[PDB]
Design a protein around this ligand. Structure first.
Ligand SMILES: [Cu+2]
Ligand SMILES: [Zn+2]
Ligand SMILES: [Zn+2]
Ligand SMILES: [Zn+2]
Lengths: 153, 153
């Protein structure tokens, strides 16, 4: 009963469509879709703070982090709201995304509408990498594609 | 949010960046920026309902109209929330946009974050066209460029 969508675009072409559905405001968000053009393996997948793509994906700023916590994986209590972990691409470069997440929302203060979804070059280390960057970004490298999350029918 | 931004893109030469700022809750929204690639003259300018660009600008749906009103211009009481009138391009194809609007908002029920800004082929007739489409769409013709309105820093 609330729906959102994001068209991911980046050089490659890396491209995909990601859908979001939340049946009630107190429930989880289902995230699903497909991304093509990726190298085989895990790729970091995050909601970033700003829905600003004026200079490409860099303009999206840091991870969406309304509670000012450290970076983690989606299962961790200490995580950014935008920490959705990794997506996995197969040998053909396609990632079939299927996530349920209870921390993001399509309404209220953890709302991700109007923010940027980003898929990364490298895997997110989920804050377990033991360098400074691990608990900020997860070391997921460059931003390969992004889009602004919009309200859907 | 107090600031928002939209990058307008389409299949042709029309592109631009539009900024939004609302200093006070329920206060006016300043709308400003530049659009290039346009034919000289007026071009309709609207917020459409969905932030869905999966098949380009057509996917954005109808005018944003939460109050179930007829189509009008920005200075009319009878208007859709998304009715921002026309932008004017010069011979070089550049429209410098500078609007203040108090019907749109960057929060609450009239919030435009996560919806689509669209610039059109033709002028919007502001509901004065005397055909049935005038009070629905304004007869502004094709959608030349669009983008999702995102949260800005
Ligand atoms: Cu329009
Ligand atoms: Zn990221
Ligand atoms: Zn993070
Ligand atoms: Zn209208």
């Amino acid at each position: 009963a609330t729906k959102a969508v994001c068209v991911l675009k980046g050089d490659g072409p890396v491209q995909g469509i990601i859908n979001f559905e939340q049946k009630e405001s107190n429930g989880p968000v289902k995230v699903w879709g497909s991304i093509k053009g990726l190298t085989e393996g895990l790729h970091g997948f995050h909601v970033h703070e700003f829905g600003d793509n004026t200079a490409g994906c860099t303009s999206a700023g840091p991870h969406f982090n309304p509670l000012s916590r450290k970076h983690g994986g989606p299962k961790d209590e200490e995580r950014h709201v935008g920490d959705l972990g990794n997506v996995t691409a197969d040998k053909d470069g396609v990632a079939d995304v299927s996530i349920e997440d209870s921390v993001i929302s399509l309404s209220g203060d953890h709302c991700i509408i109007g923010r940027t979804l980003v898929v990364h070059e490298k895997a997110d280390d989920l804050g377990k990498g033991g360098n400074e960057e691990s608990t900020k970004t997860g070391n997921a490298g460059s931003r390969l594609a992004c889009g602004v999350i919009g309200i859907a029918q």
